[PDB]
Design a protein around this ligand. Structure first.
Ligand SMILES: *[C@@H]1O[C@H](CO)[C@@H](O[C@@H]2O[C@H](CO)[C@@H](O[C@@H]3O[C@H](CO[C@H]4O[C@H](CO)[C@@H](O)[C@H](O)[C@@H]4O)[C@@H](O)[C@H](O[C@H]4O[C@H](CO)[C@@H](O)[C@H](O)[C@@H]4O)[C@@H]3O)[C@H](O)[C@H]2NC(C)=O)[C@H](O)[C@H]1NC(C)=O
Ligand SMILES: *[C@@H]1O[C@H](CO)[C@@H](O[C@@H]2O[C@H](CO)[C@@H](O[C@@H]3O[C@H](CO)[C@@H](O)[C@H](O)[C@@H]3O)[C@H](O)[C@H]2NC(C)=O)[C@H](O)[C@H]1NC(C)=O
Ligand SMILES: *[C@@H]1O[C@H](CO)[C@@H](O)[C@H](O[C@@H]2O[C@H](CO)[C@@H](O)[C@H](O)[C@H]2NC(C)=O)[C@H]1NC(C)=O
Ligand SMILES: *[C@@H]1O[C@H](CO)[C@@H](O)[C@H](O[C@@H]2O[C@H](CO)[C@@H](O)[C@H](O)[C@H]2NC(C)=O)[C@H]1NC(C)=O
Ligand code: A2G
Ligand code: A2G
Ligand code: NAG
Ligand code: NAG
Ligand code: NAG
Ligand code: NAG
Ligand code: A2G
Ligand code: A2G
Ligand code: A2G
Ligand code: A2G
Ligand code: A2G
Ligand code: A2G
Ligand code: A2G
Ligand code: CA
Ligand code: CA
Ligand code: CA
Ligand code: CA
Ligand code: CA
Ligand code: CA
Ligand code: CA
Ligand code: CA
Ligand code: CA
Ligand code: CA
Ligand code: CA
Ligand code: CA
Ligand code: CA
Ligand code: CA
Ligand code: CA
Ligand code: CA
Lengths: 5, 105, 1166, 151
């Protein structure tokens, strides 16, 4: 996934 | 200021390495000592076969004294070239490895 | 001719005096003198200097073995000392006065009668062996012996030979001499011989005292342990971790890892003061340089070894490379060395290592059987270094060169977990976390260390306070600061041509060519991380941070940018939702804004107009803020996933990347108008943007297709860089000079490739926990001007905002709630369209700095606003306290409920600990578990493991060497008993590695076994693009596309052969360069009658049309109907169309722009 | 005419129709252009340029102009620095609105075909007289001392 979270 | 084929590439590989100017400056002064070991080894490398033929010529003559005397010099001369053989190799490995690691990253 | 040798030979000039026997009569080197060896070399008893790394590399280097003199301890080559004998059952030697004295002295009973093996302590051998001097009883018979100074000859065992008494370990303290005149001990200046063999401190010096940390507070006590004075109690639930002292100024320095500060106090008390309070989040250890009055300290949050003055100024970072877990530190200013221990390094091995006091020449001093080195002290007079191990449980000693390794104490029953260590005279003082006490032990060999101030916590530091412990010497930097412009740091005495010092530079400056003048640094690589924001040199020759790291306990840094004019760095902390600015040297930190932030992905700074931009992934918008006056405006809104933003001041454009499903890179004026897509095809997950200022090109990275592209500022002439080796998930990038610095998430590293085609990828920093953004600090590029920075008038005559605009123009702007007047330069308030707004909602307390937290966070003993506004003035004037807190009895203070009855006295009046009932309930520990005397349950397998799992030392009590391990435990040979889960875990827990000996791997089907059989990895890492296995076997044999084709799962672009996922074919958006994935044969899609059909093909409810939300996610439902009033209620295969025809190339062929021709894509010549 | 040329204190039409007051009494300027006090627009780079383009001299108001020394300045009222031997050389070059560059040197005079407009020392070429443009700096280019009927 590319989400920074 | 270099002549040995082995040392020449090390200096060339050194200029593309991670060496700081102070590290590079001290690196050259180590290669100078490394070449002196090589040229010392190279000088005795000739002397081994020169005395080997000298030992062979005397053995053909047949004098027990000259055979014994030349052999006594010969075996010690073999120790000289054998002992210098590893010192050159050991220094070669360290220098090659250091520039290999400095170029690894 | 030439050098005539001693027997008439033409020896070459350079052969004489080259440390080699060249002359035939051994006379070629007598008449000259040699050089001495520098600090980085080892003198090998012949004058021959060899590299420090050659010492104990396993290879003899001086035909004397002088550099391999027993650097492994407890070996087979005993050849035991006079009046000693070896019991055959083990590698142990016992003195004759013990051997067969009637009591078993080898623990196995191998020096007394063993009839089961047919051995008795006999004496009959002397009758025929006919000893030269004396005989004794052994399990073999009468053994011959000879007086001290001589040992039994090994040819015959009847004669005896002259032996050196000075070679026995512990014959005399310090040094001994006079081999011919029998052994005698010499004590140096300030030392006097007592009783013989015992150096003793002179009466002229003050009484020796031991200062140490009992776990929470600093204590002082004399050597005999008769008195114990508390020197300084810790405040605010602090902890004294590492202590040290300066004698001449009579000061004690200690570090408080919990408060995150370094303190200094006078030896008698008073004059307590902080020394460092920034970037010291975890100051593990400490060591003062008394000769130069410096304070070396170990920091473990950002692993490094710093140097400061005794009053805290002039910070310099010395050693940073390859430091993973620095724990111990010590130095000897007299000779110039610095010793520190690293119980885990980035390469993997733990090491005790030596360096100059400036980090010039690092050498791995101890590497074999090193485990977890936890503390270092050094005998300043015998030139030895003592270190302890918490894992292999020993205390060991090597020379300053690491040659002679000897052990003084070992075994889990003696030193279960040593942390600190110090020595004085003959006794080593070390603290241990398992026995929870300071311990005294002889510096030579201790059979049972005596106790010293048993404590109820983990004792963290110990050192001996005495004058002889800090010798008496002249500092080279005393002569007018050594000529150094800023900082003069010592080195080895032989370094710098004999000067013994080098000049160092503070953080904001760099050392010039003359290595004496410090000039301001101009460029360095600034990068963020989850843990800290760091600035490192662009060159990899030196890896020392150029700016002091920015760090916080709760921290997640993502956005970064710099302001070279004032040498400040902006950053955003994703855990606090606050944007800070901090100077390079760390002196001044303030907040830019902390109001209305959700997830600030990326900052960017317009250095000319001084406007700070940032994207907000939570609000799905970008905001511009001016620094001179805090005007703030949300210029762009209603985005989907804005990640990276770059602003071009001179050109006038701002560039932006959105990584939603129809991903695009957009550009707009700095105003925020003219927002139009610039790259919206063949794109997915554009995580980062950068501008090549030298050529005016826009670089960006794609984390889905795993590529780096670049293009002009108009999006035209798009080119793709070459394949990067292991880049599999790039996040951020920057362009500096010829190279591009890409950050990778999966690699967790910063890599550098050429901006032309990629090329020679070089890893800059591996091992970053979460790397995020990079940025090229550069004072050269932050120059220039436009109409927003004219010298003749203010900021372009615009009142609040001025924005650069293409073709060198400028436009003005106004804050929120304020409107631009007719003049187009001055603003006026507009409460009609943008009415005033409060700091935030109702169920929230507005903090002073702009933040606001859920109300119940008010007055609960925890600083949630990060400026202590929510914890200000609690429990008074009905400014009451939350239920989650503990209120003080008299009021005026409230503390977290976890602090109630927590054995710490937090509240001032002590009410938090008074009247606290016990918790000795009627409870059972599970029979599969062991009951600590603290009444906490631990697994029964953790007993006698030499680790304090109970936090009270109960589980390791009574675990003497006389015992077994539990049936569910494995035995380390005379080391400890371990859990079986540590057998074939991968690493050696045993002292000799008996836990990992010769067992094989059991990798499961959910894992993959590397070809070398070294280790297994998860099946997810098989065929991903990263060499997880050491031999790269995980990536060998992985599937590839056919040459010029794409996998069956994908879809191929007709225009240029790009491979895209099959789902991207016929999904409404032209994900191809020429629309190949949205051809005429595309079956369209519709939605339910109760659903609206968005432009991109989404379906949203009838009531949701123009409801005020981006349900369509492309604004179709909002942009369509605005009627809401104010109220108060062919060369290859061909395809046919209506009149024309479509030429389709077969897979592996690409269509030429003419629309008819097809070209093969494989570079294989037919 | 281009729309950039509307009411910018320059007679682009050649007759004042583009400078007509009753349209720029309502017309607003382009966000990228400076605005004078009278409301007429002006390209921004004319701001603080030593030229009175606004008419009200507002485009030159409050500019921190450079100081210079007598070797290259006589303190022309607009703030220009103009070289020595270029003051009182016979031709205006600092474009002072009173033509103060030359008039500071009273007693000079020049031969004909270089007209001494008024009593000031300047001597403009005769070809500029009655060419339709008032460019002597003084009044004597089209005021009734010539070009009235003798042409
Ligand atoms: C490193 O280098 C420094 C500088 O040379 C040394 O410091 C000196 O060390 C000696 C050894 O202790 C000190 O000598 C003692 O001085 C005491 C008084 O001096 C203090 O007070 C005076 C003012 O009255 C100050 O000027 C001075 O700085 C000190 O603060 C005496 O009281 C001592 O004698 C007492 O004990 C003896 C028995 O031991 C009795 O016979 C005497 O009657 C008396 O009761 C003693 O003379 C000297 O003062 C130190 N000077 C300084 C400036 O510190 C370090 O020792 C040195 N380190 C090493 C190991 O070499
Ligand atoms: C993805 O980007 C492309 C290119 O920016 C968008 O296509 C359209 O491209 C033209 C420029 O070639 C843009 O301007 C138009 O140019 C023509 C002349 O060729 C002119 O007659 C039109 O009046 C117009 O100015 C056009 O604005 C641009 N479309 C948009 C909406 O920007 C393409 O649309 C982009 N993808 C998406 C999803 O919009
Ligand atoms: C760090 O320690 C030094 C003393 O060496 C101290 O001067 C620094 O600033 C002080 O910090 C105090 C707490 O923040 C503050 O109350 C005090 O006003 C301030 N003193 C001055 C004048 O600078 C310390 N810095 C910090 C942030 O602790
Ligand atoms: C809560 O916080 C304020 C500070 O913002 C603190 O001053 C208040 O204490 C006092 O409460 C009084 C009401 O009982 C009020 O009259 C008084 O002005 C106020 N402060 C002073 C000057 O004593 C806290 N409580 C309240 C109720 O606001
Ligand atoms: C012997 C006995 O009563 N054993 C129980 C045990 O079974 C479990 O309930 C435990 C929980 O703390 O407390 C007790
Ligand atoms: C065979 C034998 O002596 N076994 C014992 C074992 O029962 C236990 O006491 C252990 C210590 O926990 O020491 C040993
Ligand atoms: C006897 O022992 C000595 C060492 O003490 C050794 O050097 C020598 O080679 C041995 N042999 C004899 C017979 O001397
Ligand atoms: C696990 O690996 C070991 C290696 O000794 C092997 O003997 C055994 O068959 C494997 N299977 C299991 C789960 O025991
Ligand atoms: C005056 O002229 C001199 C050169 O002769 C120059 O140094 C100086 O800067 C000038 N201006 C002032 C303000 O003195
Ligand atoms: C500037 O010169 C103009 C003529 O172009 C003149 O009308 C005006 O009076 C001058 N300014 C002043 C302050 O005299
Ligand atoms: C030995 O040579 C080194 C070379 O760097 C230093 O000059 C050193 O000081 C010399 N030895 C001594 C004791 O001065
Ligand atoms: C109120 O909110 C607006 C946006 O709706 C602006 O962010 C403004 O700055 C806010 N005002 C305050 C006091 O923070
Ligand atoms: C005080 O007020 C706060 C805020 O409303 C909480 O309600 C808290 O529980 C109150 N406590 C007391 C003792 O009144
Ligand atoms: C403390 O309180 C607990 C509560 O369960 C028990 O009553 C326990 O016995 C008490 N301790 C003592 C020493 O009485
Ligand atoms: C990858 O797979 C293809 C078949 O799809 C070919 O076997 C190709 O040779 C493989 N890759 C390489 C580099 O050999
Ligand atoms: C598309 O699907 C929707 C689903 O509700 C309707 O069935 C609609 O009639 C379909 N459109 C066409 C052209 O078949
Ligand atoms: C003013 O005129 C400019 C230039 O023609 C624009 O038309 C603008 O929309 C007008 N109105 C305002 C309020 O600036
Ligand atoms: Ca020699
Ligand atoms: Ca060696
Ligand atoms: Ca015995
Ligand atoms: Ca242990
Ligand atoms: Ca990817
Ligand atoms: Ca709180
Ligand atoms: Ca408490
Ligand atoms: Ca345990
Ligand atoms: Ca293990
Ligand atoms: Ca892999
Ligand atoms: Ca598509
Ligand atoms: Ca909606
Ligand atoms: Ca006009
Ligand atoms: Ca002007
Ligand atoms: Ca002139
Ligand atoms: Ca004229």
């Amino acid at each position: 996934x590319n989400x920074x979270x | 200021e270099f002549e040995e084929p082995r040392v020449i590439d090390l200096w060339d590989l050194a200029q593309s390495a991670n060496f700081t100017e102070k590290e590079l400056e001290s690196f050259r002064e180590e290669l100078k000592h490394f070449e002196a070991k090589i040229e010392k080894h190279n000088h005795y490398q000739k002397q081994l076969e020169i005395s080997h033929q000298k030992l062979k010529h005397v053995e053909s003559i047949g004098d027990p004294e000259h055979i014994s005397r030349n052999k006594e010099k010969y075996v010690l001369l073999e120790e000289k070239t054998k002992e210098l053989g590893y010192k050159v190799k050991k220094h070669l490995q360290d220098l090659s490895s250091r520039v290999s690691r400095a170029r690894h990253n | 001719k030439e050098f005539e040798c001693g027997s008439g030979e033409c020896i070459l000039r350079a052969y004489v005096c080259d440390h080699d026997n060249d002359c035939e009569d051994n006379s070629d080197e007598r008449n000259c003198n040699y050089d001495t060896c520098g600090g980085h070399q080892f003198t090998c008893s012949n004058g021959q200097c060899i590299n420090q790394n050659w010492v104990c590399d396993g290879d003899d280097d001086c035909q004397d073995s002088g550099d391999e003199d027993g650097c492994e301890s407890n070996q087979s080559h005993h050849r035991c000392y006079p009046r000693e004998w070896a019991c055959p059952g083990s590698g142990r030697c016992i003195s004759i006065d013990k051997v067969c004295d009637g009591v078993p002295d080898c623990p196995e009973g191998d020096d007394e009668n063993n009839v089961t093996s047919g051995r008795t302590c006999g004496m009959g051998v002397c009758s025929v062996l006919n000893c030269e001097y004396q005989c004794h009883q052994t399990p073999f018979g009468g053994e011959c012996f000879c007086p001290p100074g001589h040992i039994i000859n090994s040819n015959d065992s009847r004669t005896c030979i002259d032996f050196d008494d000075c070679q026995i370990w512990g014959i005399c303290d310090q040094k001994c001499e006079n081999r011919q005149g029998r052994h005698q001990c010499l004590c140096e200046e300030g030392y006097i011989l007592e009783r013989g063999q015992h150096c003793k401190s002179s009466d002229s010096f003050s009484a020796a005292s031991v200062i140490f940390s009992n776990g929470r507070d600093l204590l002082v006590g004399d050597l005999h342990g008769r008195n114990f004075r508390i020197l300084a109690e810790s405040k605010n639930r602090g902890m004294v971790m590492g202590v040290d002292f300066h004698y001449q100024k009579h000061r004690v320095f200690w570090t408080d890892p919990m408060q995150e500060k370094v303190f200094s106090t006078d030896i008698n008390g008073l004059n307590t003061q902080e020394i460092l309070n920034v970037s010291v989040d975890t100051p593990e250890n400490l060591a003062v340089d008394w000769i130069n009055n410096k304070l070396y300290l170990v920091e473990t949050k950002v692993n490094r070894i710093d140097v400061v003055n005794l009053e805290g100024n002039q910070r310099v970072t010395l050693i940073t490379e390859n430091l993973g877990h620095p724990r111990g530190i010590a130095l000897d200013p007299t000779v110039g060395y610095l010793f520190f221990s690293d119980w885990g390094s980035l390469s993997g091995q733990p090491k005790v290592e030596r360096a100059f006091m400036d980090g010039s020449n690092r050498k791995d001093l101890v590497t074999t059987k090193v485990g977890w080195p936890a503390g270092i002290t050094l005998d300043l007079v015998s030139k030895r270094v003592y270190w302890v191990d918490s894992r292999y449980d020993y205390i060991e000693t090597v020379t300053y060169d690491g040659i002679q390794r000897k052990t003084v104490a070992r075994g889990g029953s003696l030193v279960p977990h040593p942390f600190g260590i110090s020595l004085f005279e003959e006794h080593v003082f070390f603290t241990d976390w398992t026995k929870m006490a300071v311990m005294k032990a002889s510096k030579f060999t201790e059979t049972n260390p005596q106790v010293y101030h048993q404590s109820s916590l983990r004792p963290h530091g110990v050192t001996v306070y005495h004058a002889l412990r800090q010798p008496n010497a002249t500092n080279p930097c005393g002569s007018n600061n050594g000529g150094c412009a800023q900082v003069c740091v010592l080195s080895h005495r032989t370094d710098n041509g004999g000067l013994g010092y080098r000049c160092k530079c503070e953080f904001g400056f760099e050392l010039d060519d003359d290595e004496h003048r410090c000039v301001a640094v101009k460029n360095f690589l600034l990068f963020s991380s989850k843990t800290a924001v760091r600035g490192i040199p662009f060159t990899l020759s030196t890896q020392e941070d150029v700016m002091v790291p920015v760090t916080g306990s709760p921290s997640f840094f993502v956005g970064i940018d710099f302001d070279a004019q004032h040498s400040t760095v902006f950053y955003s902390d994703l855990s606090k939702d606050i944007i800070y600015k901090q100077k390079i040297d760390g002196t001044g930190k303030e907040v830019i804004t902390a109001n209305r932030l959700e997830s600030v992905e990326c900052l960017t700074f317009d250095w000319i107009s001084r406007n700070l931009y940032w994207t907000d992934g939570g609000l799905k918008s970008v905001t511009v803020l001016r620094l001179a006056d805090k005007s703030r405006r949300q210029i762009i809104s209603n985005l989907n996933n804005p990640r990276s933003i770059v602003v071009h001041p001179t050109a006038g454009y701002m560039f932006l990347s959105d990584w939603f499903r129809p991903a695009k890179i957009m550009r707009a004026w700095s105003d925020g108008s003219h927002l139009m897509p610039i790259v919206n095809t063949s794109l997915g997950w554009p995580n980062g943007l950068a501008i090549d200022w030298s050529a005016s090109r826009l670089y960006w990275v794609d984390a889905f297709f795993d590529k780096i592209e670049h293009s002009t500022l108009d999006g035209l002439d798009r080119k793709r860089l070459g394949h990067v080796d292991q880049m599999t998930h790039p996040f951020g990038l920057t362009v500096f000079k010829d190279n591009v610095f890409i950050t990778d998430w999966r690699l967790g590293a910063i890599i550098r490739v050429r901006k032309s085609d990629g090329g020679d990828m070089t890893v800059i920093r591996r091992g970053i926990s979460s790397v995020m953004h990079v940025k090229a600090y550069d004072a050269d590029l932050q120059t220039g001007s436009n109409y927003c920075s004219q010298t003749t008038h203010a900021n372009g005559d615009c009142s609040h905002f001025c924005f650069p605009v293409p073709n060198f123009q400028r436009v003005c702007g106004c804050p929120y709630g304020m409107k631009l007047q007719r003049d187009q330069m001055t603003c006026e308030g507009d409460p009609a369209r943008e009415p005033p707004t409060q700091q935030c909602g109702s169920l929230s307390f507005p903090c002073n700095n702009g933040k606001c937290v859920p109300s119940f966070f008010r007055c609960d003993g925890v600083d949630d606003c990060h400026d202590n506004s929510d914890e200000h003035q609690c429990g008074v004037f009905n400014n009451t306290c939350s239920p989650s807190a503990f209120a003080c009895v008299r009021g005026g203070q409230c503390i977290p409920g976890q602090w109630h009855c927590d054995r710490q006295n937090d509240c001032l009046d002590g009410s938090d600990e008074q009247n606290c009932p016990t918790h000795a309930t009627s409870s059972t520990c599970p029979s599969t578990s062991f009951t600590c005397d603290n009444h906490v349950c631990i697994p029964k397998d953790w007993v006698c493991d030499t680790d304090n799992d109970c936090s009270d030392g109960s589980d390791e009590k009574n675990c003497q060497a006389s015992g077994t391990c539990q049936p569910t435990q494995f035995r380390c040979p005379d080391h400890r008993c371990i859990s079986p889960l540590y057998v074939c875990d991968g690493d050696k827990d045993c002292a000799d590695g008996s836990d990992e000996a010769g067992c094989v791997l059991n990798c499961t089907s959910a894992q993959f076994k590397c070809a070398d059989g070294s280790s297994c990895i998860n099946s997810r890492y098989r065929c991903d693009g990263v060499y997880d296995c050491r031999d790269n076997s995980d990536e060998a044999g992985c599937p590839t596309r056919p040459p010029g084709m794409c996998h069956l799962d994908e879809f191929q672009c007709q225009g240029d052969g790009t491979c895209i996922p099959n789902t991207w074919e016929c999904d409404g958006h032209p994900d191809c360069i020429h629309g190949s994935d949205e051809h005429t044969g595309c079956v369209p899609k519709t939605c339910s009658p109760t659903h609206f059909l968005c432009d991109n093909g989404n379906c949203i409810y009838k009531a949701w049309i123009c409801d005020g939300d981006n349900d369509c996610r492309d604004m179709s439902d909002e942009k369509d109907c605005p009627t809401q009033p104010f109220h108060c209620p062919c060369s290859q295969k061909c395809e046919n169309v209506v009149g024309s025809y479509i030429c389709k190339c077969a897979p592996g062929y690409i269509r030429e722009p003419d629309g008819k021709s097809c070209r093969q894509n494989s570079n294989i010549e037919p």
